Coordinates of all heavy atoms in Angstrom, one line a residue:
Chain G
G50 N -7.8 39.7 -12.0 CA -6.9 38.5 -12.2 C -7.6 37.2 -11.8 O -8.7 36.9 -12.3
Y141 N -36.6 47.7 -12.5 CA -37.3 46.8 -11.6 C -38.3 47.6 -10.9 O -38.0 48.6 -10.4 CB -36.4 46.0 -10.7 CG -35.5 45.0 -11.4 CD1 -34.4 45.4 -12.2 CD2 -35.8 43.6 -11.2 CE1 -33.6 44.4 -12.8 CE2 -35.0 42.7 -11.8 CZ -34.0 43.1 -12.6 OH -33.2 42.1 -13.2
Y243 N -32.3 25.1 17.1 CA -33.0 25.9 16.2 C -34.0 25.0 15.5 O -33.9 23.8 15.5 CB -32.1 26.5 15.2 CG -31.3 25.5 14.4 CD1 -31.8 25.0 13.3 CD2 -30.0 25.2 14.8 CE1 -31.1 24.1 12.5 CE2 -29.3 24.2 14.1 CZ -29.9 23.7 13.0 OH -29.2 22.8 12.2

Side-chain angles (χ1 to χ4, degrees):
Chain G
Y141 286 73
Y243 58 84

